[model samples]
Target: ATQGVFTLPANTRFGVTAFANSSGTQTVNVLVNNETAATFSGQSTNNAVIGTQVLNSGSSGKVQVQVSVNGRPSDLVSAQVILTNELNFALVGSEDGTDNDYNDAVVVINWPLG
Candidate 1:
């Protein structure tokens, strides 16, 4: 279990858990909420600290960020997500009938320099 960084929006809580297969003395749990935005790290054979964060999306609820390591031992380490909103777009047409290329009918694709 592994993924991205940074908080969501508002002040949320996040945590990082790991299972050090090599050493029981290795880091196991790491809470990232209520922390600074300086850096982040994942767990490994070495006893290192992993970081994770979650920001409140203006007027949102308690969103949590759960970070995973490369692998874990005899334990669980994971999380979930909900589809609140998203931007949608459709491809009009494709040049190659076999492939789905988003070409908008113009032979010359231009960014139209400002």
Candidate 2:
């Protein structure tokens, strides 16, 4: 996916949602500065949620994602993102690689109107 990084405010408590498991072959991991903040296995269904650790109020955080196929290396996927709100977005990802369907997985990065 050609998705860009998202910036989050410091001391903010945000939540993440992952939608995967169509073929039970992939695992999506949400990362912050190379540390995994949340993981979505193939068992995760629509609207699966995880609340991440809060960053220090003095430092902002950048977010990214990693997808592993069958426990192998990160696989190819494309994300179609929606600007649900400022610094809050929804990601629709496709693992098909070649096809541009963007329906294989879904994720959301959200803040509380902060």
lDDT of 1 by residue, 94-113 (tens): 12122322121101111111
Error of 2 at 71 (Å): 4.1
lDDT of 2 by residue, 24-91 (tens): 45566776765667766654435343223333212447666666567653333433343544455535
The total of clashing pairs for model 1 equals 7
Compared with the true structure, the alpha-carbon lDDT of candidate 1 equals: 0.26
- Residue 11 in candidate 1 has what lDDT? 40
TM-score of 1: 0.21
How many residue pairs clash in each candidate at the backbone level? 7, 0
lDDT of each: 0.26, 0.52
